[PDB]
Design an enzyme around this catalytic site. Structure first.
Site, short mmCIF file in Angstrom:
data_model
loop_
_atom_site.label_atom_id
_atom_site.label_comp_id
_atom_site.label_asym_id
_atom_site.label_seq_id
_atom_site.Cartn_x
_atom_site.Cartn_y
_atom_site.Cartn_z
N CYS A 109 43.48 26.99 41.43
CA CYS A 109 44.16 28.06 42.16
C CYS A 109 43.23 29.24 42.34
O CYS A 109 42.72 29.79 41.35
CB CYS A 109 45.44 28.51 41.45
N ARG A 112 44.55 33.46 41.32
CA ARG A 112 44.99 33.75 39.96
C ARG A 112 44.77 35.19 39.52
O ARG A 112 45.24 35.55 38.44
CB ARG A 112 44.30 32.82 38.97
N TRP A 281 51.93 33.86 48.18
CA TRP A 281 51.71 34.13 49.60
C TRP A 281 50.46 33.35 50.05
O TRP A 281 49.60 32.98 49.24
CB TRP A 281 51.52 35.63 49.90
N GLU A 286 44.93 27.83 54.64
CA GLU A 286 45.86 26.75 54.33
C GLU A 286 46.64 26.35 55.57
O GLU A 286 46.80 25.15 55.86
CB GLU A 286 46.81 27.18 53.20
#
Ligand code: HEM
Ligand code: HEM
Ligand SMILES: Cc1cc(N)nc(CCc2cc(F)cc(CC[C@H]3CCCN3)c2)c1
Ligand SMILES: Cc1cc(N)nc(CCc2cc(F)cc(CC[C@H]3CCCN3)c2)c1
Ligand SMILES: C[C@H](O)[C@H](O)[C@H]1CNc2nc(N)[nH]c(=O)c2N1
Ligand SMILES: C[C@H](O)[C@H](O)[C@H]1CNc2nc(N)[nH]c(=O)c2N1
Ligand SMILES: [Zn+2]
Lengths: 410, 411
Positions: A109, A112, A281, A286
């Site tokens: 991720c 973070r 969010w 992506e």
């Protein structure tokens, strides 16, 4: 054994000692690296108490009460409950710590740096799919926040015997449908074709458009799952237009504002939470790189390049690359205009370098999966590309779990 | 034991058995992955098993395993090792080794071409001047007036590590970098340290922005010597853009021949410390890394300026926009001058075909996803969606320390 990572753009070197607390396995050996494998591979009374001990020890260390009366009392209290009940229940404060640290430990991720600001909704008193629906609607409304998005997780009751699992069958709370057609092509989202089947094939009535928000398919206490429609006024969506190409709007593209992963398993102190939807969010890529331009997805590159009148005859004109940038400029432009939180890949990766800095400085390390941290476009002009990362598995953690329809004694 | 890789874009699944022939370590353990780490003296004791392993492979490839040719060659290498502590490869064996070193190079996307390597045996060379002559002939042959041909030149193997042949340049052809007193850099920032050594060794630096560095060549463990590659042998391409006429006024150019010269070639336990090799460029090596890396020429700012882009917020993706244009210019200039180049879409598609072929006829293909995926537009190339297994086979190309850190100077 006290390893180092180098950034090759800046020569900054960090020393990693946190990996010595790693526990689970990576899938690699000294003979073969599986760093690019997408996903490599009941609790007994005996394995459960060491897992709880490990967790409670780090919890009481974080609050600076390692080896205190409150620590030892909690240790024996959970010890007793396990010997008696064959499981145990987390205190609220342990639940919040556990959830925030599952995020903190998620090596794949990039977002973070925000890990400590998570909003944790305790849904462990839920009993029914209607109740699950209620909790999930409340999550969506709170996280969406009229476009000023806020991170959240909602945690349903933990697994008991594997027969009474709570499961959200959607892979994300909000996703667009996908239908195969006579033509042989695919209408809507191809990644959701099977699930869009198992919805109709379970009772849904599809509008059979391109951007139909899927219904929720909620499974409480291992029962048959139930369909629920998320109120449209709760699903914030962004029409997609370009700041410079007025024919862009005519493409008829939109995306939803809230990314909400709902099919993962949250492990804390040995306990397994099979239903734990979380949301944050979007990073712009992506949507624009993956959702829109993957061949196995909406795959709009050809239509967009056509509209740009680019030389699509030979790959060396870099027409895919050129379209790809414009599409991602538009996604950012649309979200920012409609005042919905979004981050570009330059800002998110720069934030992550800062976060790594802080984790090495105040924690001794930061597990990180380069293959996933590096954005799917413009990789080497983002600072994470030149950053060595060590990848190891800490707990509490989010883990993958089998898809429900393969497992449910229907 | 068998292992599966899946392409998540096409659901193609492949089965690797070749990893069972793996030897050297990876750096990874069951509890840590070193997949993104850039970089993770031999006696008769361990040498004959390494030789035997290599010769068994060699004779299997020529369908002569267990033959009397195979058994006599094993015996002959055996006695040469116990008598002389090393051994010599036959010509056939050296060609096989260098091809398979390339074939085994898990970070190389260009490996579909591995069977077509031109191998130059320079094992009779003895002086730096002889090295200069061999390298000039490699550059002429490989360049081929722009119709590039893959090649490698192989200088004598290590003996006691005190008589090494080394090419001190990291690549045969590279531009100088000069640190200015005000802190700025002129030329290629990646070459500042090497340029300083060259100047210290007596090179007269013209101090331009694209000065080809001299060759610094060390034979038989002696002090290295400077040589200037004849300029008519150094093929270069002015960079222009097919739509932007101002692009030529940036004064950019690049050389045509990528030729790596600082790596170590290992074959049957023998270490060849000077083994320059060359191919042809993927466009992004020049356009993404060389020009646009923050620690290289870093022309994104100047290109974004002349494009008149919104440079105020990063979310305008002005960096991504300028990067694409620079990469179109590199491809257009090379193609227009008929200098062999390959774009990253063509090169990745070929490597997927190569990799599938290797799984079928060889049982696998070791591959480093972190290096195979191109540095721009990652997910619109098919390697991005391809699961890959990384492991080390020999013969292999290995890294070695830079010679100026280990060399004992004569004077
Ligand atoms: C707040 C902004 C956030 C951003 C920008 C962000 C970004 C990302 C991205 C880009 C990925 C790559 C996965 C993909 O490409 O599909 C990812 C993976 C992941 N994210 Fe974050 N995320 C955010 C919030 C969160 C939160 C709130 C959680 C949990 C509470 C979380 C947990 C994870 C996990 C567990 C994975 C990887 C799952 C795996 O192992 O495959 N993220 N994230
Ligand atoms: C013929 C066309 C070729 C192309 C297009 C090509 C392309 C590449 C690229 C892009 C890399 C990544 C390295 C970087 O980005 O810095 C690479 C690595 C590598 N290539 Fe190839 N290459 C070619 C030929 C060759 C040849 C002829 C050899 C040796 C005989 C070779 C051996 C290697 C090795 C050993 C590496 C690993 C580099 C490392 O670990 O640092 N390649 N190649
Ligand atoms: C909270 C959040 C924020 C954000 N900005 N983005 C996401 C989606 C990224 C993501 C996270 C996961 F935890 C799991 C997945 C799915 C994994 C595999 C299945 C299909 C392809 N990827 C995706 C989630
Ligand atoms: C034959 C060939 C073809 C091609 N098309 N391209 C190259 C250059 C790619 C390359 C290969 C190497 F074997 C080593 C390097 C440098 C290694 C590290 C040092 C700092 C960053 N890279 C580069 C070589
Ligand atoms: C730290 C990281 O491994 C390093 O930046 C690597 C990543 N992948 C790469 N890939 C290629 N082709 N070339 C490189 O120089 C690098 N650098
Ligand atoms: C096979 C490979 O692991 C797969 O394509 C991965 C690569 N890196 C990724 N990185 C991110 N962020 N998201 C992904 O889905 C993937 N997919
Ligand atoms: Zn690994």
């Amino acid at each position: 054994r006290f390893l180092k990572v180098k950034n090759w753009e800046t020569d900054v070197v960090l020393t990693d000692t946190l990996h010595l607390k790693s526990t689970l396995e990576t899938g690699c050996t000294e003979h073969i690296c599986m760093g690019s494998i997408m996903l490599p591979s009941v609790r007994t009374k005996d394995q459960l108490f060491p897992l709880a001990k490990e967790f409670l020890d780090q919890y009481y260390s974080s609050i600076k009460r390692f080896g205190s009366k409150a620590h030892m009392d909690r240790l024996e209290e959970v010890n007793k409950e396990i010997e008696s009940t064959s499981t145990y229940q987390l205190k609220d404060t342990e639940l919040i710590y556990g959830a925030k640290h599952a995020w903190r430990n998620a090596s794949r991720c990039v977002g973070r740096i925000q890990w400590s600001k998570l909003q944790v909704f305790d849904a462990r008193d839920c009993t029914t799919a209607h109740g699950m629906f209620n909790y999930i609607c409340n999550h969506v409304k709170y996280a969406t926040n009229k476009g000023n998005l806020r991170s959240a997780i909602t945690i349903f009751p933990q697994r008991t015997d594997g027969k009474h699992d709570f499961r959200v069958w959607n892979s994300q709370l909000i996703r667009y449908a996908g239908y195969k057609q006579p033509d042989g092509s695919t209408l809507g989202d191809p990644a959701n074709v099977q699930f869009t089947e198992i919805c109709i094939q379970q009772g849904w009535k599809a509008p059979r458009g391109r951007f139909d928000v899927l219904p929720l398919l909620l499974q409480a206490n291992g029962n048959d799952p139930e369909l629920f429609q998320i109120p449209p006024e709760l699903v914030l969506e962004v029409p997609i237009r370009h700041p410079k190409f007025d024919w862009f709007k005519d493409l008829g593209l939109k995306w939803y504002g809230l990314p909400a992963v709902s099919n993962m398993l949250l492990e804390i102190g040995g306990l397994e939470f099979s239903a734990c939807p979380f949301s944050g969010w979007y990073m712009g890529t992506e949507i624009g790189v993956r959702d829109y331009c993957d061949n196995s997805r909406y795959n709009i590159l050809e239509e967009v390049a056509k509209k740009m009148d680019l030389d699509m005859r030979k790959t060396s004109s870099l027409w895919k690359d050129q379209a790809l940038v414009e599409i991602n400029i538009a996604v950012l432009y649309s979200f920012q205009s409609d005042k919905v939180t979004i981050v570009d890949h330059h800002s998110a990766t720069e934030s992550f370098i800062k976060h790594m800095e802080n984790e090495y400085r105040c924690r001794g390390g930061c597990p990180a999966d380069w293959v996933w941290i590096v954005p799917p476009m413009s990789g080497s002009i983002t600072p994470v590309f030149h950053q060595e990362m060590l990848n190891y598995r800490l707990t509490p953690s989010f883990e993958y779990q089998p898809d429900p329809w393969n497992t449910h004694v229907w």
